Amino acid sequence: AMNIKELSLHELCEELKTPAWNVPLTFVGDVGGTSARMGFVREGKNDSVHACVTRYSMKRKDITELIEFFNEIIELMPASVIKRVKAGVINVPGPVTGGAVGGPFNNLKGIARLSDYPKALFPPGRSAILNDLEAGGFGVLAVSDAHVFSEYFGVMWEGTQWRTCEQEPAGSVIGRGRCLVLAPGTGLGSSLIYYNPMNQQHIVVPLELGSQTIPMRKDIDYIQTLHAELKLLPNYENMVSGAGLEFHYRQVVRGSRPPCSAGEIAKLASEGDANACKAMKKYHEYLMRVGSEASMALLPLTIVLVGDNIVNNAFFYRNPQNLKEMHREALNHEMERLGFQSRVTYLRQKKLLNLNLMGCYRCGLDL
Amino acid sequence: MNIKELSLHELCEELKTPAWNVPLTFVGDVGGTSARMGFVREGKNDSVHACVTRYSMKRKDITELIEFFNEIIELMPASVIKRVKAGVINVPGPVTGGAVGGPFNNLKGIARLSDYPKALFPPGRSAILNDLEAGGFGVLAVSDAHVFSEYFGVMWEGTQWRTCEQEPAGSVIGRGRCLVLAPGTGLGSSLIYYNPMNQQHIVVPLELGSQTIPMRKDIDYIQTLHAELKLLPNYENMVSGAGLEFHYRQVVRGSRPPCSAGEIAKLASEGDANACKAMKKYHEYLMRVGSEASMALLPLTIVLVGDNIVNNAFFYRNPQNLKEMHREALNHEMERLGFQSRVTYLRQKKLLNLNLMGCYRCGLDLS
Ligand SMILES: O=C(N[C@@H]1[C@@H](O)[C@H](O)[C@@H](CO)O[C@H]1O)OCc1ccccc1
Ligand SMILES: O=C(N[C@@H]1[C@@H](O)[C@H](O)[C@@H](CO)O[C@H]1O)OCc1ccccc1
Numbered sequence: 001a002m003n004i005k006e007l008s009l010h011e012l013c014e015e016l017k018t019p020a021w022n023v024p025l026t027f028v029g030d031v032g033g034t035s036a037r038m039g040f041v042r043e044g045k046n047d048s049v050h051a052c053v054t055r056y057s058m059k060r061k062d063i064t065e066l067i068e069f070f071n072e073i074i075e076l077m078p079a080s081v082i083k084r085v086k087a088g089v090i091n092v093p094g095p096v097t098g099g100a101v102g103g104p105f106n107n108l109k110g111i112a113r114l115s116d117y118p119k120a121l122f123p124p125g126r127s128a129i130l131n132d133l134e135a136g137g138f139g140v141l142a143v144s145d146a147h148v149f150s151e152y153f154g155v156m157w158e159g160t161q162w163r164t165c166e167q168e169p170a171g172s173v174i175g176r177g178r179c180l181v182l183a184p185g186t187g188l189g190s191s192l193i194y195y196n197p198m199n200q201q202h203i204v205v206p207l208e209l210g211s212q213t214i215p216m217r218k219d220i221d222y223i224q225t226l227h228a229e230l231k232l233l234p235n236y237e238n239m240v241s242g243a244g245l246e247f248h249y250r251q252v253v254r255g256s257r258p259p260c261s262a263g264e265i266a267k268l269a270s271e272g273d274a275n276a277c278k279a280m281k282k283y284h285e286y287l288m289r290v291g292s293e294a295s296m297a298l299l300p301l302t303i304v305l306v307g308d309n310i311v312n313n314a315f316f317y318r319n320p321q322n323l324k325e326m327h328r329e330a331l332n333h334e335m336e337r338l339g340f341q342s343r344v345t346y347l348r349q350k351k352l353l354n355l356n357l358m359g360c361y362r363c364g365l366d367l
Numbered sequence: 368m369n370i371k372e373l374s375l376h377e378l379c380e381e382l383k384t385p386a387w388n389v390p391l392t393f394v395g396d397v398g399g400t401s402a403r404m405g406f407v408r409e410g411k412n413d414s415v416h417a418c419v420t421r422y423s424m425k426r427k428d429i430t431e432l433i434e435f436f437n438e439i440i441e442l443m444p445a446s447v448i449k450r451v452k453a454g455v456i457n458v459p460g461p462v463t464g465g466a467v468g469g470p471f472n473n474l475k476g477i478a479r480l481s482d483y484p485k486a487l488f489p490p491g492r493s494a495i496l497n498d499l500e501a502g503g504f505g506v507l508a509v510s511d512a513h514v515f516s517e518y519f520g521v522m523w524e525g526t527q528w529r530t531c532e533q534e535p536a537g538s539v540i541g542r543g544r545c546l547v548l549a550p551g552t553g554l555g556s557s558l559i560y561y562n563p564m565n566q567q568h569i570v571v572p573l574e575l576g577s578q579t580i581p582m583r584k585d586i587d588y589i590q591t592l593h594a595e596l597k598l599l600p601n602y603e604n605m606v607s608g609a610g611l612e613f614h615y616r617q618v619v620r621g622s623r624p625p626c627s628a629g630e631i632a633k634l635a636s637e638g639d640a641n642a643c644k645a646m647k648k649y650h651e652y653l654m655r656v657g658s659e660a661s662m663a664l665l666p667l668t669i670v671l672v673g674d675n676i677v678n679n680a681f682f683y684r685n686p687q688n689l690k691e692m693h694r695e696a697l698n699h700e701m702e703r704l705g706f707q708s709r710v711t712y713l714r715q716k717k718l719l720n721l722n723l724m725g726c727y728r729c730g731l732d733l734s
């Protein structure tokens with residue numbers, strides 16, 4: 001159903017001359033902190049979705065470098081092909097106003113301005129800048145609508161409310177309820193797929209749950225230790241990020257060691273290393289606190305953890321002890337005395353898929 | 368829109384008028400102690416006219432509403448009830464599927480639409496809303512009738528307003544997200560999301576009030592309330608009637624008798640130093656709801672609504688109190704990048720039942 005081809009800039013040029021690619025096109029771009037995958041999507045035979053993209057490196061760590069890539073693409077591509085571009089959607093790893101202005105970025109310098117992009121890739125009134133988890137959320141909806149939900153998402157635990165509005169198995173469809181998508185990677189991403197009961201419609205509402213000040217449990221001292229390193233009141237992202245895992249790893253080993261990065265800490269936990277595993281537990285404990293607060297504030301039917309990080313950490317979630325402690329923490333809220341946290345079904349992405357690119361495409365269709 | 372409070376019998380009379388011979392919407396605004404229910408019509412020159420009767424919630428039970436509906440059906444002509452084409456009520460609790468009103472703080476039982484009479488609640492044209500979901504539909508109704516500056520006053524203009532809108536702050540809702548806060552008996556919250564893709568606003572219900580409060584430099588003050596409640600304080604615990612009483616008891620330290628919220632507000636309006644200090648403290652946690660939500664939800668506007676807000680006008684007009692409220696709304700680590708400054712704050716400056724306007728507007732989107 002879901003098809004993405006990674007190619008060099010030149011292989012892409014040739015692929016598009018195929019009679020298969022002689023149809024209407026959407027320009028799409030998934031932009032992250034290091035790299036960006038940009039290219040073209042078509043509708044395929046038997047209702048399928050086929051994309052071809054090339055990887056660019058964000059060498060300059062500047063969001064305005066994207067313009068170069070667009071121009072590079074327009075010249076180095078045949079006009080016949082560009083003429084079939086009927087819609088243009090990219091995502092960026094920051095907050096976006098009016099689908100047009102991508103806001104201050106943690107990693108990257110500058111501001112994403114739709115009005116500076118070339119109209120041959122971004123047709124007026126048929127183009128948009130999304131936040132990366134806005135795109136993610138359109139992706140989750142694309143997966144549900146293509147009926148392959150259980151191919152790509154696995155249930156972590158079923159909540160109370162699932163059977164009250166759905167008779168199908170948990171994880172077989174997104175559900176006629178709000179879905180909160182959380183992407184713990186470089187940054188902590190969050191979007192709310194709102195469910196409008198009047199018209200049974202799902203709508204993607206971007207969030208910045210990651211930049212909320214962390215509320216206390218019994219961790220006052222642990223929060224204050226990071227407060228004194230950052231010289232900032234910790235937010236969720238400070239505890240649930242690359243930097244966050246490093247922090248938990250430094251707090252566990254209780255002494256100087258030679259450097260290991262988040263990457264190295266994950267690799268070590270997958271090899272059975274006690275200390276790295278305790279770092280991952282700690283990380284997942286703050287991730288579940290984002291969930292318990294948001295389970296009350298936003299009343300989701302489902303919470304879905306998405307991204308490469310989540311798929312690559314499958315070793316962590318398969319362990320039923322890790323899952324049991326995550327679940328205990330997801331219920332660790334005063335409002336659990338009335339069942340609010342128990343209501344919620346948690347899922348995780350269990351198979352690699354660029355949600356963001358599928359989401360840029362679904363967004364292009366609604367436009 | 369014109370509303371009129373009448374006894375059960377006068378209501379019966381008014382509807383026999385040839386003026387009320389037209390298609391009707393049933394509406395109900397249900398609160399802690401009372402409920403206003405009746406009928407809305409479209410008038411000549413696009414006017415909007417409503418007629419309701421008051422009921423008291425003697426039982427403090429949500430299921431008593433059924434009686435009121437039955438009482439209305441018998442004591443009304445069949446001719447009249449037959450012109451009911453839509454049915455919308457609001458309740459002071461969280462609602463799933465527009466049909467089931469979840470456990471309530473103030474009242475016993477569960478609001479089930481499926482138990483209401485179809486004569487007032489036509490299938491597929493009826494809904495139970497949360498009180499601030501209704502409030503949100505109201506704010507939209509006021510904006511669309513071009514009288515936004517009649518009912519709302521700017522407290523301060525944020526930096527995002529002039530990019531998104533060329534009309535004056537407070538003259539329209541805005542093509543952006545509006546977070547509506549109702550600090551009354553309970554703390555109400557809803558988010559009027561603005562779709563970029565289409566210029567459509569949708570009301571997203573929230574329970575911001577029940578989130579655990581994140582600290583500033585107030586660990587001891589939070590812990591004082593922690594020890595009285597035997598629960599981790601949430602925003603509602605600090606920003607409610609119980610909240611005001613707490614702030615007052617802390618100010619006096621047993622120097623003076625205890626007080627109701629009503630009493631405390633009356634005294635601050637008369638210039639009582641202690642009561643004023645209690646109101647500052649209350650407004651300090653209200654602005655923390657706003658600063659945390661300004662990051663999480665990225666609103667263009669925050670609007671404070673309700674009789675409470677209108678009746679406390681004296682508090683917001685004092686430029687000292689407003690300057691300190693503003694300082695506190697910017698009290699957030701993410702202000703170093705402008706996020707809290709983005710947001711325009713307004714207050715309801717003239718009485719209006721937003722919820723009843725909202726039940727009606729909701730009905731229109733349904734029929
Ligand atoms: O950038 C964002 N927030 C971004 C989110 O938009 C994004 O979804 C997430 C996943 O990529 O990373 C967060 O860091 O916040 C603005 C900000 C935060 C911190 C410093 C500067 C700017
Ligand atoms: O009742 C609600 N929350 C209600 C809100 O829905 C409502 O909008 C607000 C103003 O009317 O009061 C809150 O208290 O939460 C569930 C709850 C909270 C505390 C104890 C029991 C149940």
